[PDB]
Amino acid sequence: FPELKNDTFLRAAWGEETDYTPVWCMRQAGRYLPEFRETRAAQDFFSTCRSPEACCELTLQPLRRFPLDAAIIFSDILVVPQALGMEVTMVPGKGPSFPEPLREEQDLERLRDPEVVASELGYVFQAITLTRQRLAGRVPLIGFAGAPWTLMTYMVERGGSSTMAQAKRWLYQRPQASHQLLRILTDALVPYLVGQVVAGAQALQLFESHAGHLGPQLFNKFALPYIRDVAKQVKARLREAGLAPVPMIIFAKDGHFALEELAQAGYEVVGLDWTVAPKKARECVGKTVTLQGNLDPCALYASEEEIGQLVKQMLDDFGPHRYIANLGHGLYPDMDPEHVGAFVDAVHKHSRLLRQ
Amino acid sequence: FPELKNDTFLRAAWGEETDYTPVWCMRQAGRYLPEFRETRAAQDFFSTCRSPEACCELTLQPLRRFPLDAAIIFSDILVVPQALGMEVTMVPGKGPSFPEPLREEQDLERLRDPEVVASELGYVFQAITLTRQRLAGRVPLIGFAGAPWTLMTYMVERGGSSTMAQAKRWLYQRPQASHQLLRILTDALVPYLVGQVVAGAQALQLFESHAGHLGPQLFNKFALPYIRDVAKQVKARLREAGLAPVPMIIFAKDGHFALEELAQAGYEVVGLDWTVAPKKARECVGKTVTLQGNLDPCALYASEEEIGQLVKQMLDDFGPHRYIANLGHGLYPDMDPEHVGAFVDAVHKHSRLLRQ
Ligand SMILES: Cc1c2[nH]c(c1CCC(=O)O)Cc1[nH]c(c(CCC(=O)O)c1C)Cc1[nH]c(c(CCC(=O)O)c1C)Cc1[nH]c(c(C)c1CCC(=O)O)C2
Ligand SMILES: Cc1c2[nH]c(c1CCC(=O)O)Cc1[nH]c(c(CCC(=O)O)c1C)Cc1[nH]c(c(CCC(=O)O)c1C)Cc1[nH]c(c(C)c1CCC(=O)O)C2
């Protein structure tokens, strides 16, 4: 692979001093880009995901608009449940759906052995390699996957729940079957994530998007052990393969209650949602993890001038060390690309001013 | 009105020592009760709300099953937007809907003057009086309303949003119109809440159910001032009317980031969701507010034996002083009444053991 030109993102991830704060945005390849919609109009969603060229193109799109300090591959977290044997449909203007969720412990029987999952996701590896080659060292490439608990919620729920009541019913009523499912997911995720790095990913983000539906006690029993195992096992397998381990990012959305635990879970970076004050997060995690985030994505509905002032405040709170700027969640589909541009320019402008 | 027999709930609310921990459950009059469904089958939802006898009956139902230490009137937070002139429909198996949300600043013109709202909600006052008379002093009666921000989200959104992106777009793009709407809501809520107490309510809970979609900065600008004003103004009007002010409870769901602010907002009690560790909440709020909550409602899917152990742990964390037990949110419609029974008995059994 081509030699990396801008490695600011990796340097911040590992906790090193940099000349400016690196920035990227969750869902930077997304519907808010007119060119994304155009490209996506040509295949259905999961067919797009299975085309290395389409995936590479969508990844590159935001970089052509903004001097983002990292690319993130175009794919989806739900490819893992699908590779485990579940049917997932993209419902027009309504999102992902599993028409046949796991309903009882006996349904675990229709899942693939987790060890065969990486070979089912070869198309994602092809997209990563192609994208790493085409980026030609411009910025690092982030690969990613959903965390076990979050993936479980998609596998068990019949869609669009603000409570995850069915998924949580599993934890309380079927704890053994839940642990079994969470282990299956962990054992699929580890070789998949290793494969992403083998294929060229230079950093990994694990999305625990549904962390907030859990309190501390359930999170520590059912989410945290597997989060920990994913990091331990991936790092170990990369070492054994003779490869360099990549910085790993854990993002537990609405996971304020878990920050201390997450800072000791084997991840270089803890991503934060926008509800956590940067200073309080820094107290929780201490001084040896990098924090990523955390601007309210809706702040990008404000004027470019206002975005700049909000970014300035945010950077003041985080301070210059051990920090990668991002939003507190993904970009929304009605957002203005010029305002995303303003967010990028503002992190770069103010982070320099905060140093020199 | 009949003299109050069991005032444990009020004594804990004001912060006084009690012989046991008082307990009630949000949505204790709800679908999880077969008798509730039966009664509700006779009218449509908002027609039920407009019948003092139906409201009284639903309120009493849980008390006939469980020795709960408080009743809460049957009504809904959405009666306020409706009394302001918005049409709200109850969508079969899908919940409340505003077919015509406020879309722009100009839509504020179709709202009633907030001063006339209390007189539109006379039916709720009738339900409260009837219920206070029928309860005959058994336990205190809680009245309630939605907080301004939360009510705004219902008025502006086109339903079922996990982001409140439109409501938040208002805050960033239309801050002046947002403040105008939030003031209208505050000015409707104050005379309404005062009226509830005049009619017989012995405590008030304000539901900031959508607090979590905001971070600290937006919450402090747009939610907190009005929360503060509601308490200041209600207390003042009750004093002036020659009445005793009632304990007030603020419940900001997913409002971990606001606890310190909320403890100095003029409320006797801060209600907590289940994601906040009781000990951390106690550090945030200090020693002069009462905490209410906070058991994961899904914990009631566990066995009666498990519920007891979870309750015991919870009570250990909160300690005996300045505490009212409740769930961290409302009861879900698929929950077993016997397990709600188990939750009640367990708070009573263990809180005594924790004292004597
Ligand atoms: C709508 C949706 C999809 N996939 C998913 C949803 C949300 C479903 C729900 O609310 O429960 C599920 C999903 N996909 C992803 C996550 C984790 C991140 C998160 O919490 O948002 C989750 C929870 C990562 C992703 N999913 C995707 C990426 C791509 C990285 C990038 O494109 O920049 C990631 C990290 C790509 C994707 N995937 C999808 C779209 C529309 C896109 C493009 C981005 C957009 O316009 O929203 C379909
Ligand atoms: C489904 C629904 C209703 N009303 C509402 C919803 C949720 C809509 C959404 O998710 O956005 C809106 C609502 N109603 C209430 C709140 C605040 C409390 C909360 O966050 O849940 C909110 C956010 C108080 C209430 N709403 C109600 C009470 C009654 C107090 C009690 O019944 O014990 C309260 C405090 C009564 C009510 N109101 C409704 C039902 C079905 C019931 C019975 C309880 C149940 O089975 O869920 C309709």
Side-chain angles (χ1 to χ4, degrees):
Chain A
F1 298 114
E3 188 169 292
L4 189 63
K5 301 169 61 175
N6 170 12
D7 72 339
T8 304
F9 169 80
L10 295 177
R11 287 193 320 110
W14 290 115
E16 287 147 40
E17 206 80 274
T18 54
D19 285 355
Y20 67 96
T21 291
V23 58
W24 71 281
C25 301
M26 277 172 287
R27 298 194 175 250
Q28 61 185 214
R31 296 167 277 157
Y32 77 100
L33 293 181
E35 59 267 38
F36 173 101
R37 297 186 228 111
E38 184 173 37
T39 35
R40 279 279 307 103
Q43 313 101 355
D44 68 275
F45 175 87
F46 287 109
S47 201
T48 299
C49 289
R50 298 176 169 272
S51 165
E53 293 281 354
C55 288
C56 176
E57 169 69 14
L58 294 175
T59 295
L60 291 182
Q61 280 174 3
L63 280 298
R64 296 184 192 132
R65 284 196 186 242
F66 323 112
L68 292 150
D69 297 292
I72 178 165
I73 193 67
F74 184 85
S75 202
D76 199 80
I77 72 170
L78 299 177
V79 305
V80 170
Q82 185 184 81
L84 277 167
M86 294 191 72
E87 297 291 307
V88 178
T89 70
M90 269 300 154
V91 174
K94 283 173 199 65
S97 175
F98 295 70
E100 297 84 33
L102 311 173
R103 277 283 128 175
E104 58 212 26
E105 172 184 3
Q106 189 199 37
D107 296 344
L108 298 190
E109 292 182 322
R110 65 173 198 261
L111 304 181
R112 276 181 185 111
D113 164 15
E115 288 178 359
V116 317
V117 162
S119 68
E120 284 312 306
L121 298 165
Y123 67 87
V124 177
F125 306 150
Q126 295 179 278
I128 291 165
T129 298
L130 177 59
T131 300
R132 173 89 182 259
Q133 286 289 8
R134 294 277 177 82
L135 270 170
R138 184 186 294 180
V139 281
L141 180 55
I142 306 167
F144 71 89
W149 159 246
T150 284
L151 287 179
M152 161 164 186
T153 64
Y154 285 101
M155 293 162 83
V156 152
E157 288 280 342
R158 41 164 125 271
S161 181
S162 74
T163 59
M164 302 307 154
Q166 286 293 340
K168 292 173 57 180
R169 185 161 199 153
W170 272 73
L171 301 193
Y172 286 115
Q173 296 198 339
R174 302 166 178 264
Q176 295 159 63
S178 298
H179 282 303
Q180 183 182 355
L181 178 52
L182 292 162
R183 184 60 62 202
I184 286 171
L185 282 160
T186 294
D187 292 344
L189 287 164
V190 168
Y192 175 44
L193 291 159
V194 171
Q196 288 190 51
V197 175
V198 172
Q202 287 157 304
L204 296 168
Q205 183 156 317
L206 200 75
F207 288 94
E208 190 73 281
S209 307
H210 290 177
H213 296 280
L214 304 176
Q217 288 158 81
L218 274 189
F219 189 91
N220 292 351
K221 274 199 223 193
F222 289 101
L224 180 69
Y226 305 102
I227 287 173
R228 284 172 65 82
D229 297 343
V230 162
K232 177 185 192 151
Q233 286 187 47
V234 167
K235 289 183 179 183
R237 291 200 197 192
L238 292 167
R239 289 197 268 85
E240 301 172 23
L243 295 188
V246 299
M248 298 182 75
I249 304 143
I250 179 62
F251 175 63
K253 187 190 174 289
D254 287 314
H256 65 93
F257 55 82
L259 295 171
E260 186 165 13
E261 291 63 34
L262 292 176
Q264 312 297 337
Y267 291 78
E268 285 62 41
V269 179
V270 180
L272 307 168
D273 65 68
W274 70 94
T275 73
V276 178
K279 296 189 189 160
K280 293 178 180 179
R282 194 71 82 185
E283 305 175 309
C284 289
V285 297
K287 260 181 81 87
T288 79
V289 299
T290 285
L291 291 181
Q292 171 173 274
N294 66 343
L295 188 72
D296 182 6
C298 297
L300 299 191
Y301 295 133
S303 71
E304 297 190 22
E305 164 175 335
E306 286 146 14
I307 296 168
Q309 307 156 181
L310 292 161
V311 168
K312 176 179 180 327
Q313 187 56 68
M314 185 171 68
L315 275 47
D316 289 344
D317 281 1
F318 276 106
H321 311 298
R322 285 162 260 104
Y323 175 53
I324 301 161
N326 201 315
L327 303 180
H329 199 21
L331 284 164
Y332 301 171
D334 66 344
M335 289 176 177
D336 182 345
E338 303 303 317
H339 288 192
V340 177
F343 171 67
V344 174
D345 293 335
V347 175
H348 289 160
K349 171 178 155 214
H350 179 52
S351 63
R352 289 178 179 288
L353 292 174
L354 170 63
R355 278 153 179 78
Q356 217 283 253
Chain B
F1 298 114
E3 188 169 292
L4 189 63
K5 301 169 61 175
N6 170 12
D7 72 339
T8 304
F9 169 80
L10 295 177
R11 287 193 320 110
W14 290 115
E16 287 147 40
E17 206 80 274
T18 54
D19 285 355
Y20 67 96
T21 291
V23 58
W24 71 281
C25 301
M26 277 172 287
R27 298 194 175 250
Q28 61 185 214
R31 296 167 277 157
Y32 77 100
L33 293 181
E35 59 267 38
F36 173 101
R37 297 186 228 111
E38 184 173 37
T39 35
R40 279 279 307 103
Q43 313 100 355
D44 68 275
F45 175 87
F46 287 109
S47 201
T48 299
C49 289
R50 298 176 169 272
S51 165
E53 293 281 354
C55 288
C56 176
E57 169 69 14
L58 294 175
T59 295
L60 291 182
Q61 280 174 3
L63 280 298
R64 296 184 192 132
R65 284 196 186 242
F66 323 112
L68 292 150
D69 297 292
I72 178 165
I73 193 67
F74 184 85
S75 202
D76 199 80
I77 72 170
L78 299 177
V79 305
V80 170
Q82 185 184 81
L84 277 167
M86 294 191 72
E87 297 291 307
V88 178
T89 70
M90 269 300 154
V91 174
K94 283 173 199 65
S97 175
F98 295 70
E100 297 84 33
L102 311 173
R103 277 283 128 175
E104 58 212 26
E105 172 184 3
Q106 189 199 37
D107 296 344
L108 298 190
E109 292 182 322
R110 65 173 198 261
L111 304 181
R112 276 181 185 111
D113 164 15
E115 288 178 359
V116 317
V117 162
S119 68
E120 284 312 306
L121 298 165
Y123 67 87
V124 177
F125 306 150
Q126 295 179 278
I128 291 165
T129 298
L130 177 59
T131 300
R132 173 89 182 259
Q133 286 289 8
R134 294 277 177 82
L135 270 170
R138 184 186 294 180
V139 281
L141 180 55
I142 306 167
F144 71 89
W149 159 246
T150 284
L151 287 179
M152 161 164 186
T153 64
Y154 285 101
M155 293 162 83
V156 152
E157 288 280 342
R158 41 164 125 271
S161 181
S162 74
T163 59
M164 302 307 154
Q166 286 293 340
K168 292 173 57 180
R169 185 161 199 153
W170 272 73
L171 301 193
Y172 286 115
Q173 296 198 339
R174 302 166 178 264
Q176 295 159 63
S178 298
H179 282 303
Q180 183 182 355
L181 178 52
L182 292 162
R183 184 60 62 202
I184 286 171
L185 282 160
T186 294
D187 292 344
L189 287 164
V190 168
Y192 175 44
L193 291 159
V194 171
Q196 288 190 51
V197 175
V198 172
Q202 287 157 304
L204 296 168
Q205 183 156 317
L206 200 75
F207 288 94
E208 190 73 281
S209 307
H210 290 177
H213 296 280
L214 304 176
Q217 288 158 81
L218 274 189
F219 189 91
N220 292 351
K221 274 199 223 193
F222 289 101
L224 180 69
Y226 305 102
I227 287 173
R228 284 172 65 82
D229 297 343
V230 162
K232 177 185 192 151
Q233 286 187 47
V234 167
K235 289 183 179 183
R237 291 200 197 192
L238 292 167
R239 289 197 268 85
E240 301 172 23
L243 295 188
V246 299
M248 298 182 75
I249 304 143
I250 179 62
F251 175 63
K253 187 190 174 289
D254 287 314
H256 65 93
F257 55 82
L259 295 171
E260 186 165 13
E261 291 63 34
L262 292 176
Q264 312 297 337
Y267 291 78
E268 285 62 41
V269 179
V270 180
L272 307 168
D273 65 68
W274 70 94
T275 73
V276 178
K279 296 189 189 160
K280 293 178 180 179
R282 194 71 82 185
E283 305 175 309
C284 289
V285 297
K287 260 181 81 87
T288 79
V289 299
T290 285
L291 291 181
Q292 171 173 274
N294 66 343
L295 188 72
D296 182 6
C298 297
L300 299 191
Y301 295 133
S303 71
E304 297 190 22
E305 164 175 335
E306 286 146 14
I307 296 168
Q309 307 156 181
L310 292 161
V311 168
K312 176 179 180 327
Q313 187 56 68
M314 185 171 68
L315 275 47
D316 289 344
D317 281 1
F318 276 106
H321 311 298
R322 285 162 260 104
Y323 175 53
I324 301 161
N326 201 315
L327 303 180
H329 199 21
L331 284 164
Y332 301 171
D334 66 344
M335 289 176 177
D336 182 345
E338 303 303 317
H339 288 192
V340 177
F343 171 67
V344 174
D345 293 335
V347 175
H348 289 160
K349 171 178 155 214
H350 179 52
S351 63
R352 289 178 179 288
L353 292 174
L354 170 63
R355 278 153 179 78
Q356 217 283 253

Coordinates of all heavy atoms in Angstrom, one line a residue, chain A residues 27 29-31 36-37 39-52 54-55 58 73-80 82 88-98 123-124 144 154 192:
Chain A
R27 N -20.8 9.1 9.4 CA -21.7 9.2 8.2 C -21.3 10.3 7.2 O -22.1 10.8 6.5 CB -23.2 9.3 8.7 CG -23.7 8.1 9.4 CD -25.2 7.9 9.6 NE -25.5 6.6 10.3 CZ -26.1 5.6 9.7 NH1 -26.5 5.6 8.4 NH2 -26.2 4.5 10.5
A29 N -19.8 9.9 4.5 CA -20.4 9.3 3.3 C -21.8 9.0 3.6 O -22.2 8.0 4.1 CB -19.7 8.1 2.8
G30 N -22.7 10.0 3.2 CA -24.1 9.8 3.5 C -25.1 10.7 2.7 O -24.6 11.4 1.8
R31 N -26.4 10.6 3.0 CA -27.4 11.1 2.1 C -27.4 12.7 2.0 O -28.0 13.2 1.1 CB -28.8 10.7 2.7 CG -28.9 9.1 2.6 CD -30.1 8.6 3.3 NE -29.7 8.4 4.7 CZ -30.6 8.3 5.8 NH1 -31.9 8.4 5.6 NH2 -30.1 8.2 7.0
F36 N -23.9 11.4 -3.2 CA -24.2 10.1 -2.6 C -25.5 9.5 -3.1 O -25.6 8.3 -3.4 CB -24.2 10.3 -1.1 CG -24.6 9.0 -0.3 CD1 -23.6 8.2 0.3 CD2 -25.9 8.7 -0.2 CE1 -24.0 7.0 1.0 CE2 -26.3 7.5 0.5 CZ -25.4 6.7 1.1
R37 N -26.5 10.3 -3.1 CA -27.9 9.9 -3.5 C -27.9 9.4 -4.9 O -28.4 8.3 -5.2 CB -28.9 11.1 -3.3 CG -29.0 11.6 -1.9 CD -30.1 12.6 -1.8 NE -29.6 13.7 -1.0 CZ -29.4 14.9 -1.5 NH1 -29.6 15.2 -2.8 NH2 -28.9 15.9 -0.7
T39 N -25.2 8.3 -6.7 CA -24.5 7.0 -6.8 C -25.4 5.8 -6.3 O -25.5 4.8 -6.9 CB -23.2 7.0 -6.0 OG1 -23.4 7.8 -4.9 CG2 -22.1 7.7 -6.8
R40 N -26.0 6.1 -5.1 CA -26.9 5.1 -4.5 C -28.2 4.8 -5.3 O -28.8 3.8 -5.1 CB -27.2 5.6 -3.1 CG -26.1 5.2 -2.1 CD -26.1 3.8 -1.6 NE -27.5 3.4 -1.1 CZ -28.3 2.7 -1.7 NH1 -28.0 2.2 -2.9 NH2 -29.5 2.4 -1.2
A41 N -28.5 5.7 -6.2 CA -29.7 5.4 -7.0 C -29.6 4.2 -8.0 O -30.6 3.6 -8.4 CB -30.2 6.7 -7.7
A42 N -28.3 3.9 -8.3 CA -27.9 2.8 -9.2 C -28.1 1.3 -8.7 O -28.4 0.4 -9.5 CB -26.5 3.1 -9.8
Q43 N -27.8 1.1 -7.4 CA -28.1 -0.3 -6.9 C -29.0 -0.1 -5.6 O -29.2 1.0 -5.1 CB -26.8 -0.9 -6.4 CG -25.6 -0.9 -7.4 CD -24.5 0.1 -7.0 OE1 -24.7 1.0 -6.1 NE2 -23.4 0.1 -7.8
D44 N -29.6 -1.2 -5.2 CA -30.2 -1.3 -3.8 C -29.1 -1.2 -2.8 O -27.9 -1.4 -3.1 CB -31.1 -2.5 -3.6 CG -30.3 -3.8 -3.6 OD1 -30.1 -4.3 -4.7 OD2 -30.0 -4.3 -2.5
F45 N -29.4 -1.0 -1.5 CA -28.4 -0.7 -0.5 C -27.4 -1.8 -0.3 O -26.2 -1.5 -0.2 CB -29.0 -0.2 0.8 CG -28.0 0.0 2.0 CD1 -27.4 1.2 2.1 CD2 -27.7 -1.0 2.8 CE1 -26.5 1.5 3.1 CE2 -26.7 -0.8 3.8 CZ -26.1 0.4 4.0
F46 N -27.8 -3.0 -0.1 CA -26.9 -4.1 0.3 C -26.1 -4.5 -1.0 O -25.1 -5.2 -0.9 CB -27.6 -5.2 1.1 CG -27.9 -4.8 2.5 CD1 -29.2 -4.6 2.9 CD2 -26.9 -4.6 3.4 CE1 -29.5 -4.2 4.2 CE2 -27.1 -4.2 4.7 CZ -28.5 -4.0 5.2
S47 N -26.7 -4.2 -2.2 CA -25.9 -4.5 -3.4 C -24.8 -3.5 -3.6 O -23.7 -3.8 -4.0 CB -26.9 -4.4 -4.6 OG -26.4 -5.1 -5.7
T48 N -25.1 -2.2 -3.3 CA -24.0 -1.1 -3.1 C -22.9 -1.7 -2.2 O -21.8 -1.6 -2.6 CB -24.6 0.2 -2.5 OG1 -25.7 0.7 -3.4 CG2 -23.6 1.3 -2.5
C49 N -23.3 -2.2 -1.1 CA -22.3 -2.7 -0.1 C -21.4 -3.8 -0.6 O -20.3 -3.9 -0.2 CB -23.0 -3.1 1.2 SG -23.7 -1.8 2.2
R50 N -22.0 -4.6 -1.6 CA -21.3 -5.7 -2.2 C -20.5 -5.3 -3.5 O -19.9 -6.2 -4.1 CB -22.3 -6.8 -2.4 CG -22.9 -7.4 -1.2 CD -24.0 -8.5 -1.4 NE -24.4 -9.2 -0.2 CZ -23.8 -10.2 0.3 NH1 -22.8 -10.8 -0.3 NH2 -24.3 -10.8 1.4
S51 N -20.5 -4.1 -3.8 CA -19.7 -3.6 -4.9 C -18.4 -2.8 -4.4 O -18.6 -1.7 -3.9 CB -20.5 -2.7 -5.8 OG -19.7 -1.9 -6.7
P52 N -17.2 -3.4 -4.5 CA -16.0 -2.7 -4.1 C -15.9 -1.3 -4.7 O -15.5 -0.3 -4.0 CB -14.9 -3.6 -4.5 CG -15.5 -5.0 -4.5 CD -17.0 -4.8 -4.9
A54 N -18.3 0.8 -5.9 CA -19.3 1.7 -5.4 C -18.9 2.1 -4.0 O -19.0 3.3 -3.6 CB -20.7 1.0 -5.4
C55 N -18.4 1.2 -3.2 CA -18.0 1.5 -1.8 C -16.9 2.4 -1.8 O -16.9 3.4 -1.0 CB -17.7 0.2 -1.0 SG -19.1 -0.8 -0.6
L58 N -18.1 6.1 -2.8 CA -18.9 6.8 -1.7 C -17.9 7.2 -0.5 O -18.1 8.3 0.0 CB -20.0 5.8 -1.1 CG -21.1 5.6 -2.1 CD1 -22.1 4.6 -1.6 CD2 -21.8 6.9 -2.5
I73 N -14.6 3.5 5.6 CA -15.2 2.7 4.6 C -16.7 2.8 4.5 O -17.4 2.9 5.6 CB -14.7 1.2 4.6 CG1 -15.0 0.5 3.4 CG2 -15.3 0.5 5.9 CD1 -14.2 1.0 2.1
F74 N -17.2 2.8 3.3 CA -18.7 2.6 3.2 C -19.1 1.1 3.3 O -18.6 0.3 2.5 CB -19.2 3.2 1.8 CG -20.7 3.0 1.8 CD1 -21.5 4.0 2.3 CD2 -21.3 1.9 1.2 CE1 -23.0 3.8 2.3 CE2 -22.6 1.8 1.1 CZ -23.5 2.7 1.7
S75 N -19.9 0.8 4.3 CA -20.4 -0.5 4.6 C -21.5 -0.3 5.6 O -22.0 0.8 5.7 CB -19.3 -1.4 5.2 OG -19.6 -2.8 5.0
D76 N -21.9 -1.4 6.2 CA -22.9 -1.2 7.3 C -22.6 -2.1 8.5 O -22.1 -3.2 8.2 CB -24.3 -1.3 6.8 CG -25.4 -0.7 7.7 OD1 -25.5 0.5 7.6 OD2 -26.0 -1.4 8.5
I77 N -23.0 -1.8 9.7 CA -22.9 -2.7 10.8 C -23.7 -4.0 10.6 O -23.4 -5.1 11.1 CB -23.1 -2.1 12.2 CG1 -24.6 -1.8 12.5 CG2 -22.1 -0.9 12.5 CD1 -24.9 -1.4 13.9
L78 N -24.8 -3.9 9.8 CA -25.7 -5.0 9.8 C -25.3 -6.1 8.8 O -25.9 -7.1 8.8 CB -27.2 -4.5 9.4 CG -27.7 -3.5 10.5 CD1 -29.1 -3.0 10.0 CD2 -27.8 -4.2 11.8
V79 N -24.2 -5.9 8.2 CA -23.6 -7.0 7.3 C -23.2 -8.2 8.2 O -23.2 -9.4 7.7 CB -22.4 -6.6 6.5 CG1 -22.8 -5.3 5.6 CG2 -21.2 -6.3 7.4
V80 N -22.9 -8.0 9.4 CA -22.6 -9.1 10.3 C -23.8 -10.1 10.6 O -23.7 -11.3 10.3 CB -21.8 -8.7 11.6 CG1 -21.7 -9.8 12.6 CG2 -20.4 -8.1 11.2
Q82 N -26.3 -10.4 8.8 CA -26.7 -11.0 7.6 C -25.8 -12.1 7.2 O -26.2 -13.2 6.7 CB -26.7 -9.9 6.5 CG -27.1 -10.4 5.1 CD -27.0 -9.3 4.1 OE1 -25.9 -9.1 3.6 NE2 -28.1 -8.6 3.9
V88 N -32.0 -9.4 6.0 CA -32.2 -8.0 6.3 C -32.6 -7.2 5.1 O -32.0 -7.3 4.1 CB -30.9 -7.3 6.9 CG1 -31.1 -5.8 7.2 CG2 -30.3 -8.1 8.1
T89 N -33.7 -6.4 5.2 CA -34.2 -5.7 4.0 C -34.1 -4.2 4.3 O -34.2 -3.8 5.5 CB -35.6 -6.1 3.7 OG1 -36.5 -5.6 4.7 CG2 -35.8 -7.6 3.7
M90 N -33.7 -3.4 3.3 CA -33.8 -1.9 3.5 C -35.1 -1.4 3.1 O -35.5 -1.4 1.9 CB -32.6 -1.2 2.7 CG -31.3 -1.1 3.4 SD -31.5 -0.1 4.9 CE -30.1 -0.7 5.9
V91 N -35.9 -1.0 4.1 CA -37.3 -0.5 3.8 C -37.3 0.9 3.4 O -36.9 1.8 4.1 CB -38.2 -0.8 5.1 CG1 -39.6 -0.2 4.9 CG2 -38.2 -2.3 5.4
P92 N -37.9 1.1 2.1 CA -38.0 2.5 1.5 C -38.4 3.5 2.5 O -39.4 3.4 3.2 CB -39.1 2.3 0.5 CG -39.0 0.8 0.1 CD -38.5 0.1 1.3
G93 N -37.5 4.5 2.7 CA -37.7 5.7 3.6 C -38.0 5.3 5.0 O -38.6 6.1 5.8
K94 N -37.6 4.1 5.4 CA -37.8 3.6 6.8 C -36.6 2.8 7.4 O -36.6 2.6 8.6 CB -39.1 2.7 6.8 CG -40.4 3.4 6.8 CD -41.6 2.4 6.6 CE -42.9 3.1 6.1 NZ -42.7 3.7 4.7
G95 N -35.6 2.5 6.6 CA -34.4 1.9 7.1 C -34.3 0.4 7.1 O -35.1 -0.2 6.5
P96 N -33.3 -0.1 7.8 CA -33.1 -1.6 7.9 C -34.2 -2.3 8.7 O -34.7 -1.8 9.6 CB -31.8 -1.7 8.8 CG -31.7 -0.4 9.6 CD -32.3 0.7 8.6
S97 N -34.5 -3.5 8.2 CA -35.5 -4.3 8.9 C -35.1 -5.8 8.8 O -34.5 -6.2 7.7 CB -36.9 -4.0 8.3 OG -37.8 -4.9 8.8
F98 N -35.3 -6.5 9.9 CA -35.2 -8.0 9.9 C -36.6 -8.5 10.0 O -37.2 -8.5 11.0 CB -34.4 -8.4 11.2 CG -33.0 -8.0 11.2 CD1 -32.6 -6.7 11.4 CD2 -32.0 -9.0 11.1 CE1 -31.3 -6.3 11.5 CE2 -30.7 -8.6 11.2 CZ -30.3 -7.2 11.4
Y123 N -16.4 -9.5 0.3 CA -16.7 -8.2 -0.4 C -16.3 -7.0 0.3 O -15.9 -5.9 -0.3 CB -18.2 -8.2 -0.8 CG -19.2 -8.1 0.3 CD1 -19.6 -6.9 0.8 CD2 -19.9 -9.3 0.8 CE1 -20.6 -6.8 1.8 CE2 -20.8 -9.2 1.8 CZ -21.2 -7.9 2.3 OH -22.2 -7.8 3.3
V124 N -16.4 -7.0 1.7 CA -16.0 -5.8 2.5 C -14.5 -5.7 2.4 O -14.0 -4.6 2.2 CB -16.5 -5.9 3.9 CG1 -16.0 -4.7 4.7 CG2 -18.0 -6.1 4.0
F144 N -14.8 -0.7 10.5 CA -15.7 -0.6 11.6 C -16.6 -1.8 11.7 O -16.8 -2.6 10.8 CB -16.5 0.7 11.6 CG -17.6 0.7 10.4 CD1 -18.9 0.2 10.7 CD2 -17.3 1.2 9.2 CE1 -19.8 0.2 9.6 CE2 -18.2 1.2 8.1 CZ -19.5 0.7 8.4
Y154 N -30.6 -5.5 17.1 CA -31.2 -5.6 15.7 C -31.6 -7.0 15.4 O -32.6 -7.2 14.7 CB -30.1 -5.2 14.7 CG -30.0 -3.7 14.7 CD1 -29.0 -3.0 15.3 CD2 -30.9 -2.9 13.9 CE1 -28.8 -1.7 15.3 CE2 -30.8 -1.5 13.9 CZ -29.8 -0.9 14.6 OH -29.6 0.4 14.6
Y192 N -13.6 -11.0 11.5 CA -14.0 -9.9 10.6 C -13.2 -8.7 10.7 O -12.7 -8.2 9.7 CB -15.5 -9.6 10.8 CG -16.1 -8.5 10.0 CD1 -15.8 -8.3 8.6 CD2 -17.0 -7.5 10.5 CE1 -16.3 -7.3 7.8 CE2 -17.5 -6.5 9.8 CZ -17.2 -6.4 8.4 OH -17.7 -5.4 7.7

